[PDB]
Structures are given as structure tokens and as C-alpha cells.
Design a protein around this ligand. Structure first.
Ligand SMILES: O=C(Nc1ccc(F)cc1)C1(c2ccc(-c3ccc(C4CC4)nc3)cc2)COC1
Length: 374
């Protein structure tokens, strides 16, 4: 058993199970905007609309799911407001009527006031048919930015990979129990199962091509996911009017915000967040952009003993082969993510009349390769 305090689902892992679609009536003015962003942005009514909103309390967002749906709604509106039509005409100040509730809600959920992976992937989905299984074809996102933005493809394939890797997450207790009870055969079986789920996760990742378009992604969706930390477009950051007197920098959406993106590297003793390098700094900093229960989960993995030391100590080819099966699977995932960045960011950028992400991932991959045993 993984503790329920870590918010991990048997079926969907780190994803929020059955995310709420609708808010209470008190927040109808937020939902009218968030549900109609494609029209409200393409006609320039979005910015004016947000300015005409009253400042609403967060006291009526009672349960976790409602609070998370609101974080998604406000996060998407914040991005839509800041970036507008997404042609470099930017807002350096977020209006108090939306800033105050978003910042208060954010502090309550222990997340930064900006759209993160946990919002727009982990909570931004529904099933069409509850009886049918979790396939792309039985699924939809709750919110989008623009028509043709491929948010469905981008978020749902991302989500499907998260789900696929969650099959391994439930093996992790088996892994730690087998070490302390010195159960070689159990540990071997666990590591081969983990390798198998990450192999499946990669096959799932292939769907990205079927549902996402390079032009659309680069020109449109990338812009809406962009944040304001070390971004020339908002040099000093964003002003959360009525909450902070001074502007504040926050990072945009990133796969590094996925707890699955990190947790196996941790489990397998791949010291990604050790180094003192930019990649190690980035990964650690993104733990603050994950929900608190999830970042706690990563922390408890780190506190448990080292799987890598355990395998190394034993002089056991079979265990080393199973540990390496897992390492190989992660390498492949990194390699694949790089091909996606190449097709969807590098090449489109070149046609415009990526590099930092490439170098970031090359380092992560290289650190992974160097963790192989044989
Ligand atoms: O960028 C991505 N989604 C993304 C979504 C929302 C954002 F706000 C920002 C980004 C993509 C991606 C998806 C999964 C991984 C991934 C998941 C697990 C692992 C295992 C190895 C640990 N590896 C990779 C990497 C990227 C989708 O296509 C690119």
C-alpha cells in the first residue's frame, strides 16, 4: 500500500481521478470565460471580460476537486489574459479581481499562481463514456485556449503516458519491502514489472504524432503554456495586483512538473537533482510546482534506502539485468521526448521568418545512461 496522504490513485496514479467539470453557481462568471476562451480571445473580448469581473471569495470552494477545477479555470484565464491572442502583446499586471482569489487559492493548495502540469494535464480531462476505458477516443479535455491549438492531443497523450507509468507506481512498495526482507526473487519481479510499464508508457507516447501538429504547437499552444521566469517578454515577472506590491516570476508548464518524470529516477538512484548543474536545479525547483502530496512522495522515495546500492552489493547478474531494463526504459523515454522537441519546437522555430530544453534533456538522458550497471 502507498499511503493515501500522497494522493496516488490505483488506476490513474498522480492524475486527479474523475476531475470536476463544473463549479458552484457562485463562480459562474469564471466558467463563462474559461469555457469560451477560443471565441473570447479570437474576438478580443477576453481581456475586457476579466476586467469586468467582481472579486470573488474562495470560501465556497469546499472540497479538493472543486479547488483544483478552479485552479485550472483561473490558470487558463491568467494565461489568456497575459498572452492575449499570443502575438507578443503582453499584460504585465494581472487585475486584483482575479489575482487575489487565484493567489489565495494557490497558497491554500500550496502551488504557485500560474498554470502548471497538475492543472492542465492532471485535472483537465473527462471521460466521454464512464463505462468505456481510458483511451484517447473515450476522452476529452475540459479546457482549451484556441481552436486548432492541439490542447486535446498534447494534454491527453501527456496524461495517458502519466497513467501508463502509474502501473509501475504501485510496485514501489514491493521494491522497498523486498530489500528489507531480502527477497531477491520478489525484487527481480518488481524491477521487471517496472521496466514493463515504462516500455508501455513509451508506446503510448507515440500517439502524440497522431493528434498534435508541429505548426499549431509551436505557434499557438507553446505560447499559452509559457510562464514569466527569465522571460524577456516579462522581464521583472508578473504583478499579482492586490496580492504582491512587486512583480513575481514563475515558470511555465513543463514535463519536469510531472512526478512520474522524476520519481523513477529517484527510485532507481539516478542522482538527477545532484550535480549543482542547471538541470539538477530545474528538477528540484519544479517539485514546488507539483501538488504538495506528490512532492512529499518524491521526498519519501529519497528517504528510503537506495535500490542501486542494493543491486550493486549483491553480485547478481539477474538483478542487474532487471535494474538495467528499467534504466534502458527511461533512456528511451528521454530519447523520445527529444525527438518530440525536435519535430515540434526545433524544426518549426527554424521555419519562422528549444535549444535549452534539448540541452536540459540531453543531460537528463546522459545521467540516465551513466546509471547502467553492465
Ligand atoms: O511536454 C509534454 N507535455 C507537457 C504537458 C503540459 C505542460 F504544461 C508541459 C508539457 C510532452 C511530454 C509528455 C510526457 C513526458 C514524459 C513523461 C514521463 C516520463 C518518464 C521517464 C520518466 N518521461 C517523459 C515528456 C513530455 C507531451 O509531448 C511532450
Amino acid at each position: 500500500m502507498i499511503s493515501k496522504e500522497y494522493h496516488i490513485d490505483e488506476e490513474v496514479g498522480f492524475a486527479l481521478p474523475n476531475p470536476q467539470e463544473n463549479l458552484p453557481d457562485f463562480y459562474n462568471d469564471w466558467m463563462f470565460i474559461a469555457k469560451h476562451l477560443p471565441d473570447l480571445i479570437e474576438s478580443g473580448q477576453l481581456r475586457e471580460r476579466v476586467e469586468k469581473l467582481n472579486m470573488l471569495s474562495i470560501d465556497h470552494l469546499t472540497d479538493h476537486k472543486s479547488q483544483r477545477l478552479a485552479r485550472l479555470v483561473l490558470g487558463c484565464i491568467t494565461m489568456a489574459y497575459v498572452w492575449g491572442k499570443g502575438h507578443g502583446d503582453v499584460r504585465k499586471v494581472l487585475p486584483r479581481n482575479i489575482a487575489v482569489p487565484y493567489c489565495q487559492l494557490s497558497k491554500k493548495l500550496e502551488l504557485p499562481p500560474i498554470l502548471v502540469y497538475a492543472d492542465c494535464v492532471l485535472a483537465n480531462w473527462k471521460k466521454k463514456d464512464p463505462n468505456k476505458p481510458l483511451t484517447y477516443e473515450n476522452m476529452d479535455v475540459l479546457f482549451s485556449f484556441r481552436d486548432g491549438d492541439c490542447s486535446k492531443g498534447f494534454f491527453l497523450v501527456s496524461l495517458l503516458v502519466e497513467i501508463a507509468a502509474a502501473s509501475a507506481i504501485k510496485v514501489i512498495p514491493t521494491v522497498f519491502k523486498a530489500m528489507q526482507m531480502q527477497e531477491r526473487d520478489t525484487l527481480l519481479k518488481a524491477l521487471l514489472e517496472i521496466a514493463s510499464c515504462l516500455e508501455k508508457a513509451l508506446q503510448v507516447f507515440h500517439q502524440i504524432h497522431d493528434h498534435v501538429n508541429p505548426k499549431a504547437f509551436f505557434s499557438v499552444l507553446r505560447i499559452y503554456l509559457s510562464g514569466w521566469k527569465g522571460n524577456p517578454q516579462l522581464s521583472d515577472g508578473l504583478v499579482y495586483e492586490g496580492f504582491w506590491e512587486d512583480p513575481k516570476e514563475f515558470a511555465g508548464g513543463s514535463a519536469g512538473q510531472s512526478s512520474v518524470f522524476q520519481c523513477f529516477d529517484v527510485l532507481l538512484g539516478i542522482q538527477q537533482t545532484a550535480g549543482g548543474g542547471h538541470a539538477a536545479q530545474f528538477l528540484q525547483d519544479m517539485r514546488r510546482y507539483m501538488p504538495p502530496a506528490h512532492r512529499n512522495f518524491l521526498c519519501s522515495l529519497e528517504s528510503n534506502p537506495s535500490v542501486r546500492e542494493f543491486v550493486l552489493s549483491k553480485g547478481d547478474a539477474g538483478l542487474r539485468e532487471a535494474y538495467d531494463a528499467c534504466v534502458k526504459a527511461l533512456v528511451s523515454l528521454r530519447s523520445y521526448h527529444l525527438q518530440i522537441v525536435t519535430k515540434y519546437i526545433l524544426i518549426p522555430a527554424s521555419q519562422q521568418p528549444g535549444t535549452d530544453l534539448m540541452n536540459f534533456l540531453k543531460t537528463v538522458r546522459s545521467t540516465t545512461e551513466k546509471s547502467l550497471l553492465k
